[PDB]
């Protein structure tokens, strides 16, 4: 279980301290290693801009480019580190470049594939929804906007969440369905932390915006319905009044408004309740590493906790000397990372779609 | 949001939207078939915008 950093040319195996991070609430997974060498040796394989591939054991965790390298030495100590992110983090700080700033009738996957072409990032679309693939009647790009900003703006309206794969690709992820692992307070937990704060969760999220009137719809739409648009999503966990009004982000319809309102309600639900645990082993029970987007069964019933299933949201692996092998796994409810079409557990079309939604491994009719 | 560059990254998009709200443009194509004139304008640089509606007061009309 050695952490090998495939840099440009050769392998690097031994390390003094390793820290890797992965999450689905982010578009990259950053790593930081500590290297210790005699003063005067050549450290050029670890330089900013080199193409790195981190490999834990025989499996690749991150791939991309090296960002920073710190070297310090005092009268009684010496410390050298190195850092980096994915190749998907190349989009975060780079400005989106396209010829015609407007896409007339395109879907989110096609927009992303046209935007991530010059860099090298490959886009991956996992959702099998019929409404998440609905094409944009028109989508324009603000000038000097990063690819990350544009794709996040589109994915927020679609309800999809954008993430980075373990091989450097872009991913429009799908939440897990089958409970795979178990975390109990008695057997395999060193430390738990259960925070439950209600300072942000509201009752009724309602979104208001402007209708579509640019061109073809301008010969049909009237004057009042251009300005009068609305969407609502109600929560049953807050029993007081507690409303919220959201100004839309782009041109809006009723169904689009309802989708964003839920998107917001589910994100608030995910951000409210948080579980944190420190397990002893990097590897899982089966043997693979711990990664986000996994549905685990929590049995912290000796501490009077009544949650039964959660979804991992953040995994950070540590190799400090004082720590040993640890991985701090953070947990959030699954119902916070779903698309507005699906729900947590009127015709033949509805029945067939239900069947093919309950069974995702089957091929839809499309 | 402790570093100068981190604060710059956090605060840039708001100023970008502020600076991009109002703009100038040139007119290349005018379509009058619709109930509202649809221009095809050209923004700062290497940026086009098709089907941009023009608003004119009631009682006056003109085709540039």
């Amino acid at each position: 279980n050695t952490v090998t950093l495939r840099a440009d040319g050769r392998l690097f195996t031994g390390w003094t301290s390793v820290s890797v991070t992965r999450s689905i609430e982010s578009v990259a997974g950053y790593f930081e290693l500590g290297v210790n060498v005699p003063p005067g040796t050549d450290l050029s394989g670890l330089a900013p801009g080199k193409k790195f591939t981190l490999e834990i054991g025989g499996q690749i965790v991150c791939t991309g480019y090296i960002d920073s390298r710190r070297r310090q030495m005092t009268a009684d100590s010496m410390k050298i580190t190195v850092a980096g992110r994915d190749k998907t983090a190349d989009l975060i700080d780079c400005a989106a470049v396209y010829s015609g700033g407007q896409w007339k009738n395109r879907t989110l996957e096609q927009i992303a594939r046209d935007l991530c072409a010059p860099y090298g990032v490959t886009v991956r679309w996992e959702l099998s929804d019929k409404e998440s693939s609905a094409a944009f009647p028109g989508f324009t790009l603000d000038h000097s906007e990063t690819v990350y900003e544009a794709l996040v703006r589109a994915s927020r309206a679609r309800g999809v969440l954008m993430t980075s794969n373990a091989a450097g690709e872009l991913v429009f992820s799908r939440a897990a369905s089958t409970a795979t692992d178990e975390l109990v307070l008695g057997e395999n937990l060193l430390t738990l932390d259960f925070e439950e704060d209600f300072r942000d969760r509201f009752s009724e999220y309602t979104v208001k915006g402007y209708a579509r009137a640019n061109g073809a719809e301008g010969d049909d739409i009237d004057a009042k319905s251009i300005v009068s648009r609305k969407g609502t999503a109600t929560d049953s966990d807050v029993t007081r009044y507690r409303p919220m009004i959201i100004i839309a982000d782009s041109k809006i319809t009723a169904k689009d408004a309802q989708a964003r309102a839920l998107r917001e309600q589910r994100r608030r639900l995910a951000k409210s309740i948080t579980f944190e645990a420190e397990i002893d082993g990097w590897t899982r029970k089966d043997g693979q590493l711990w990664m986000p987007n996994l549905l685990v069964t929590i049995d912290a019933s000796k501490y009077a906790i009544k949650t039964t299933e959660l979804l991992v949201s953040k995994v950070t692996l540590i190799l400090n000397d004082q720590d040993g092998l640890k991985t701090r796994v953070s947990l959030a409810p699954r119902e916070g990372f779903l698309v507005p079409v699906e729900s947590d557990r009127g015709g033949i079309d509805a029945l067939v779609e239900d069947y093919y939604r309950r069974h995702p491994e089957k091929t839809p009719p499309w | 949001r402790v570093n100068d560059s981190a604060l710059n990254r956090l605060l840039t998009p708001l100023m970008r939207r502020v600076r991009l709200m109002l703009a100038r443009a040139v007119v290349n194509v005018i379509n009058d078939g619709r109930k509202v004139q649809n221009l095809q304008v050209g923004l700062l640089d290497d940026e086009e915008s098709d089907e941009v509606e023009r608003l004119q007061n009631y009682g006056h009309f003109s085709v540039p």
Binding site: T21, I24, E25, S26, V27, A28, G29, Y30, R85, T88, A89, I92, Y148, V152, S155, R156, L161, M162, T163, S164, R267, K271 | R1, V2, N3, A6, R9, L10, P13, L14, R17
Partner: peptide, 17 residues
Amino acid sequence: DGMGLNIYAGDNYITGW
């Protein structure tokens, strides 16, 4: 720097705007 690193990394949930 827990929040100072979440800015340099992506954030599919927008902080502002």
